[PDB]
Amino acid sequence: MGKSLIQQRRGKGSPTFKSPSHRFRGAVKYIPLNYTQEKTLRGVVEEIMHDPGRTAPVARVKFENGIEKLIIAPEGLLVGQEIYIGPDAPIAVGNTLPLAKIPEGTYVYNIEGIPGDGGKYVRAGGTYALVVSREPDKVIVQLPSGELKAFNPMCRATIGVVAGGGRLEKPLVKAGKAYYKYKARNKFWPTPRGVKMNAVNHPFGGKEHHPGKPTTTSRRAPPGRKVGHIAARRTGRRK
Template sequence: MGEPIRQQRRGKGSSTWRANSRNGKGDVEIKNAETAGTVVDIQHDPARTAPVAIVEYEDGEERAILAPETVQEGDEVHIGPSAPIEPGNTLPIGEIPEGVPIHSIETQPGDGGKLVRASGTYAFVVTHEKGGTRIRLPSKSFKKLNTQCRATIGKVAAGGRKDKPFVKAGNKHHAMKARGKKYPHVSAVAMNAVDHPFGGSAKPGMPKTVSRHASPGSKVGSVSARKTGNKTE
């Protein structure tokens, strides 16, 4: 009898599959108010791929936001519908012109920003439509959002992070360990048939869709898939 498959070992939740985020800066969200602040520091956050900017707002509160490109210490950032279209400022997407790069986008008004938060990424407004604003995500898919959902102007800093070569296996090991992933990662079709449902051969023509009620040892591939392809909404 084979060992538990990768999905079963991951689901156990042991330290092997758990990302080390104890040194993170905590929640990095857009302040839910119309205000302005000054960037007092740019810091590295071990729990994320992008640096964070520490902003001191008018009410004295200090809060971390994702650092956009070109923003530096001493710059002012504004939150509100009347804020200038400049990197670091946050506005409702209904007030942002088409083609302007944005990040840290809310999916519901006031949720603090959920989309496009990785280093070097950005989305942009495609068109303002009746009942919403359509944006294009880094995945090249489109999403329609409430015009009151807010977004921050500019690209997330630290673009090109993946261009630097790892050079040696130790650097790759530590990079994968920080993300809570097992390294090295063995392809399922390269395993023996006893170790994985995809093992033994490439199995051309074998469907990858399995039932939601399948046994844990065979629940791999597309579980209870309703359709395939990318969503456009």
């Protein structure tokens, strides 16, 4: 039977399906070796750049212990804004403090999930997490999906929103302009359909336009057969 599929290639880390890492810009680090408690730490926005692979703008920050690292840029930032990191950071936009120290009902981004791992949550253009409720036990934060995850209160986060909103408000326009974007990122394209792909190429669909077996697939289905609507609970838009 047929060849490995379009997704199975991806997993190899072969180069058509390898992100560039040499035209791409820094990652967020908050650094916990100078700790949150017994803070020492303010910095100055050294410059602001666009990061290609995040599809969002990012800030270089010059810290006052002498380390240079990027922090994902908030809206309404100036070059020469001071950003502080600690709990004794002011409670204002672009300032970074623990969740407990942040009020309830304020918008927040760049939230830690393990204390001191530098931001692994809410680091996309224009989207933001809401602090709905806070208790000394656990602080519950409401995620971009509408969905509530419980985090440790001693996670760090930055007050405000991410910059680079309206991102999908503007369209991509044409196949050319789009081609241009995908080179900037990594996303296998032009991507055709399995339906007129031969029986070898793809599990569903033959020579001509019509599906083989149902599109909807198991949650225990094999690798290389898990294409379509993956483990769909519902489909359509009707009763």
